[PDB]
Every structure is written in structure tokens, then in C-alpha cells.
């Protein structure tokens, strides 16, 4: 009955704010009741505050004051949640949802698609790249693996492509480690061929879109 | 917040019945407020599950059904599928703290393909990562099943904690799981000893790779 879209990922220092929108579309948003609920890696939920559109009022969660700031456009239908003076623990995915009309707690029957925001004291770095070259040790019967160290940038995403994109089968790519020095690392892997080692080239394309960089590493043999 | 509790993980294969609890206090379950469940697939938003402790809004399977009694909720599922492997929230209203209040999550795995050996491949910091001053030895740990491991590293078969970094496992794109190890080291670390390990536990079975700076 609602489809609500929130806006795109976030990546803030410590003490800035953030602005997250939820555009509804369907229903009659003006009329229903609209919360915002976090969620931090791995953890369970958290609720930020409402908003009551149909009298202007707006009800933040006790453990964010001044800090939450909850917002409606009437006209084109978008609400809004601001989170100021932002610390490292409000990294989370944050939800719009709605309940339904009234000033009672009702359920959550619709939710926005999340808008992941990453606070950190750390700024923009590119990967370094560095083969996982293939050898005996990677070497079993008919397959061996071989592959790219991701190392130290921030923030995520990032992407490998193997030979442009051409090399699909075979390839994972793992999740990242997040390190003390708040700079994040993951590999890629791809099992090809144990006899196609030494004749046939695999470069590992890493792409950096938040630092605007690519790297392409050729990755060879002993 | 998360003051409702329920198990941290559920376990069945497929065509079992399973049940969530839901425990909360007199402040919430407890003063006769309602309570919710949502359910979240891996990467995606919460949709609500049951509503009205009981109630399944339209295109919620039969399988589900909740209810509640004096401070506990319970959810059901009453027949597995591979797709119910997600996270359970309850949720309800606490007039102590004047707000919503959720439940701690519970994870339900559904065992729905057999027991798979995990593939092991240690490598070696590259001459490159020397030349940097650096040095990162990687383990990588691959289509295994179910999804739990425990790594463990090593300088000539005496263990190390400091310098090591691992991610939870997750799904592959055949439904296996896979999961990296990381061992930081100085240059200096890694040419003093004769040899580093990499040890893989999964289901009772123990794999250990070396690598040797020689």
C-alpha cells in the first residue's frame, strides 16, 4: 500500500550531521504515523523517534537529545530524519517506517529501504593491491587458486572484477575486516585451472568509486 | 530498546516445526500490550511478520503463527523452508520506558544441505607488501557447511592472538559458506621464525596450513 525510498549511503567524521529522506509513494503519507528505527552491525533495533504529520508534532527517543530532528514535507511527500554531533556508535542502517494513523505505538507494517550511515574519525584512502600469487601451496589436483589483497581504504564498498569483468566463475570475493586503524582490508579469489597457470593472464581489477581510484594487478606464478 | 529476549540462534531442517520465544517484564508483554514479530532476510529491510500477536498480514505463509501468554510471545513456524533462514525481531510497547521496545533477534538456520569440508589456502605475505614494510598473512577458508569456524594462528606451533583479524562467515554463490583470516605481522616477525600456521576447526575436524619465510 506504500512504497517508501530512502536516500543514499553516508559517510560522515565525527561531530557532523547527517540527513536521511524517506520519499512515499502510494497511501496517503500526510495521514500516517512515521518512525525512524536504526539498526547497528549486528545488533538489533533501535527506535530514533516519530513523527505525527496530521498535528505537526514530532515524539524523539530519550536517548537522543537535540541530536534527532524529524521532518516532513507535505508537498512532495518526503520525510526526514537529522542526526547531529554524530559519533562512531550511530553507525548503523537506518530505517524509515511507518505506522498507521493515530498516536498510539503501533506495529511497523511499512519500511523504507535503509540508508546505511558510516561514522568514523577516518578519511577517503585508496587500496593498496598486492597478489596472492598462485603456486603449489595454492594448488590441489585439477584447481588452484590465486588472488588480490585489498589493503587499508576507507570507506567501503569496493569491487574486483577479474580480467575486466570476462572472469566470473571461480570468484570470491570476501567480506572486509574492519582494522584498529579503522582502515578496512578484503581479498578476492578466483580458482581456475591448475594447467591454465603460467599461460593464461589474470589481472584483478579493483575499483575505489568513494577515492575515485582503479587498480589493475596483474597476478603471476612463483 | 532490546529489553525483550529471545534465543540467540534456532536451528531445523526442512519440514520441522520450530518455536521463538519472547520473554519480556510487567512493564511491556507482561501489561497486556500487544506484540509483533518482523522478519529479516540477510541484506534486506524488516517486514512485519505478525501482527496483533497472532494476526499475518496478506502474503505471510501459513507456516507462522504467533501468540502470547502472561510475559512471554512465541512464534512458530511450522514446517521449515530453505527461505525462512532469516532474523526474528518480537517487538511491543513498554510503558516503564514509554516506547517501543524490540527483542534481541534470533537467527534461524535451516539445515537444508549437507555437512561440506571446508577448503583451506594460507598464502604468504608478497615480496611487494616487504618491499612496504609491511607484511599480512592470509588464510582463506572456503565451501564449508554449516557455517560456524574457528581459526587459529601460529609462530612455529605456539599460538598468537595480537595481529589477528577474521571475518564471520557468509554464503557463497552456491549457498556454501566461505570466510578470511588475517595475521599482521613486521617484516622483522616474519623473518624470525621458522614457520607460520593457519589452523581451520570446523565440525570436529582440524585443517592447518604453513608457510615458511624460507
Known amino acids: 500500500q506504500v512504497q517508501l525510498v530512502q536516500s543514499g549511503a553516508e559517510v560522515k567524521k565525527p561531530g557532523s550531521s547527517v540527513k536521511v529522506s524517506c520519499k512515499a509513494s502510494?497511501?496517503?503519507?500526510?495521514?500516517?504515523?512515521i518512525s525512524w528505527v536504526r539498526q547497528a552491525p549486528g545488533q538489533g533495533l533501535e527506535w530514533m523517534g516519530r513523527?505525527?504529520?496530521?498535528?505537526?508534532?514530532?515524539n524523539p527517543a530519550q536517548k537522543f537529545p537535540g541530536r534527532v530532528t524529524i521532518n516532513v514535507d507535505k508537498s512532495t511527500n518526503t520525510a526526514y530524519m537529522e542526526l547531529s554531533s554524530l559519533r562512531s556508535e550511530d553507525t548503523a542502517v537506518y530505517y524509515c517506517?511507518?505506522?498507521?494513523?493515530?498516536?498510539?505505538?503501533?506495529?511497523?507494517?511499512?519500511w523504507g529501504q535503509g540508508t546505511q550511515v558510516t561514522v568514523s574519525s577516518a578519511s577517503t584512502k585508496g587500496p593498496s593491491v598486492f597478489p596472492l600469487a598462485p603456486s603449489s601451496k595454492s594448488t590441489s589436483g585439477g584447481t588452484a587458486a590465486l588472488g588480490c589483497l585489498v589493503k587499508d581504504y576507507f570507506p567501503e564498498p569496493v569491487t574486483v572484477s577479474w580480467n575486466s569483468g570476462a572472469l566470473t566463475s571461480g570468484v570470491h570475493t570476501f567480506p572486509a575486516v574492519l582494522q584498529s586503524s579503522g582502515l578496512y582490508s578484503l581479498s578476492s579469489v578466483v580458482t581456475v585451472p591448475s594447467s591454465s597457470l603460467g599461460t593464461q593472464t589474470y589481472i584483478c581489477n579493483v575499483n575505489h568509486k568513494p577515492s575515485n581510484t582503479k587498480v589493475d594487478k596483474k597476478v603471476e606464478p612463483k | 530498546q532490546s529489553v525483550l529476549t529471545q534465543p540467540p540462534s534456532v536451528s531445523g531442517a526442512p519440514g520441522q516445526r520450530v518455536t521463538i520465544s519472547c520473554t519480556g517484564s510487567?512493564?511491556?508483554?507482561?501489561?497486556?500490550?500487544?506484540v509483533h514479530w518482523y522478519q529479516q532476510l540477510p541484506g534486506t529491510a524488516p517486514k512485519l511478520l505478525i501482527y496483533?500477536?497472532?494476526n499475518r498480514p496478506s502474503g505471510v505463509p501459513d507456516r507462522f503463527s504467533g501468540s502470547k501468554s502472561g510475559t512471554s510471545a512465541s512464534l512458530a513456524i511450522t514446517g521449515l523452508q530453505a527461505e525462512d533462514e532469516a532474523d526474528y525481531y518480537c517487538?511491543?510497547?513498554?510503558?516503564?520506558?514509554?516506547?517501543?521496545?524490540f527483542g534481541t533477534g534470533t537467527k534461524v538456520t535451516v539445515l537444508g544441505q549437507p555437512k561440506a569440508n571446508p577448503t583451506v589456502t594460507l598464502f604468504p605475505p608478497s615480496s611487494e607488501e616487504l618491499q612496504a614494510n609491511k607484511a599480512t598473512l592470509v588464510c582463506l577458508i572456503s565451501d564449508f557447511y554449516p557455517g560456524a569456524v574457528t581459526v587459529a594462528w601460529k609462530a612455529d606451533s605456539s599460538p598468537v592472538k595480537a595481529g589477528v583479524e577474521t571475518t564471520t562467515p557468509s554464503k557463497q554463490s552456491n549457498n556454501k559458506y566461505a570466510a578470511s583470516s588475517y595475521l599482521s605481522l613486521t617484516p622483522e616477525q616474519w623473518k624470525s621464525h621458522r614457520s607460520y600456521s593457519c589452523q581451520v576447526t570446523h565440525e570436529g575436524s582440524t585443517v592447518e596450513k604453513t608457510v615458511a619465510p624460507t
Open positions: 517506517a511507518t505506522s498507521g494513523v493515530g498516536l498510539h505505538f503501533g506495529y511497523f507494517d511499512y
Open positions: 502510494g497511501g496517503n503519507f500526510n495521514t500516517y504515523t
Open positions: 513523527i505525527i504529520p496530521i498535528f505537526g508534532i514530532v
Open positions: 510487567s512493564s511491556n508483554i507482561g501489561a497486556h500490550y500487544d
Open positions: 496483533g500477536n497472532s
Open positions: 517487538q511491543s510497547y513498554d510503558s516503564s520506558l514509554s516506547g517501543y521496545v
